[PDB]
Every structure is written in structure tokens, then in C-alpha cells.
Design a protein around this ligand. Sequence first.
Ligand code: FIN
Ligand code: CA
Ligand code: CA
Ligand code: ZN
Ligand code: ZN
Length: 163
Amino acid sequence: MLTPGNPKWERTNLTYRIRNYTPQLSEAEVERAIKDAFELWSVASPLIFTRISQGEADINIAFYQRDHGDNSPFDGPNGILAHAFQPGQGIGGDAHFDAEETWTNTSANYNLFLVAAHEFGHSLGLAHSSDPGALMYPNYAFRETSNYSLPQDDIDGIQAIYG
Ligand SMILES: COc1ccc(-c2ccc(S(=O)(=O)N[C@@H](C(C)C)P(=O)(O)O)cc2)cc1
Ligand SMILES: [Ca+2]
Ligand SMILES: [Ca+2]
Ligand SMILES: [Zn+2]
Ligand SMILES: [Zn+2]
């Protein structure tokens, strides 16, 4: 359940930056979803996420449409919701979300908190899990985001990489 080559961050205090926003949510809701998604991983690892408002962060978050400068283009409504890059410099660790989705912070498709939480797993070096109850399962499926907590399989995965 660990990315090929087992790449990971050489540091536990990582910065992130939301570059732009989606018309589907208020800017604050996006920040809330993002900050909460990072927290999911922080409570199960040594990772500490620090937000910056400008400049390059270790993990840049952005909403893009179709072709957006990195070859893994998005595909319009539905289908690919987002993607991220394994730990590394430059684009490594970055997380891109399809700007053509009906993003939400509720259970309706698609909850940004859950998708971001998922992608950050990749941003941290986690690969997919075959466990349907895992956040890193290959397919999205809303889960009660209320008292939602990182599934044990993902705890195992993140732990296996950073303790
Ligand atoms: C609450 O649990 C989950 C939440 C979101 C996903 C999820 C699954 C697939 C995608 S994807 O948009 O299909 N991207 C995949 C790929 C086509 C680029 P990948 O980034 O997961 O590899 C995004 C989020 C899975 C589980
Ligand atoms: Ca980066
Ligand atoms: Ca899409
Ligand atoms: Zn991209
Ligand atoms: Zn994934």
C-alpha cells in the first residue's frame, strides 16, 4: 500500500497552499475541507501541515480544467475527480482537483473533504488499497464526514511510511 519506490517526505512539517478555488464552494469551505483533510493524516502520523497564503508550498492545491500543464489532463464532469503527485520537489506532492466537478462539503457528490483526504494520501506517498473500507480505495464513495476518522488501513499505510 506504499507508492512504487516508497517515496516520502524527508520532513514532517510540510506547507500547503490553495492556489485557486472552485465556484462550487465558498473559499472558506474549500479551506475548511482542505485543512480538515490534512488533519486526518496528521492525527495518525508525525506530519504537521502549515498553510501559507502565497508562494510555493510543499503541497500546492489547485482546481484545474482539462489540460493544465502536467499531461494528466482532467476529463470534464465526473470520471476523474482529481489526482496528486508523490512526495518530491516541484510538482511532487501537489494535488489537483477537477474544476468541472460539483464539489461539496456535504454527502452529495462530490465531497471535497473526502477526495482531498484521498489525494493527500498520494501526496504523502500512499498507493491505493484494495480494502473497500479504506480511504485509499481506488474508487470514491461518500462516507459520513461528521465524526469521520482515518480508516485503520490508511492509518497502517501512513504509519508504515512515517510512523
Ligand atoms: C472516502 O474514501 C475515498 C474518497 C475519494 C476516492 C477517490 C478515488 C478516485 C479518484 S480519481 O479522480 O479517479 N483519480 C485517480 C486517477 C484517475 C488519476 P487517483 O488520483 O486516485 O489515482 C479521486 C478520489 C477514493 C476513496
Ligand atoms: Ca510540491
Ligand atoms: Ca472529471
Ligand atoms: Zn494535474
Ligand atoms: Zn487515488
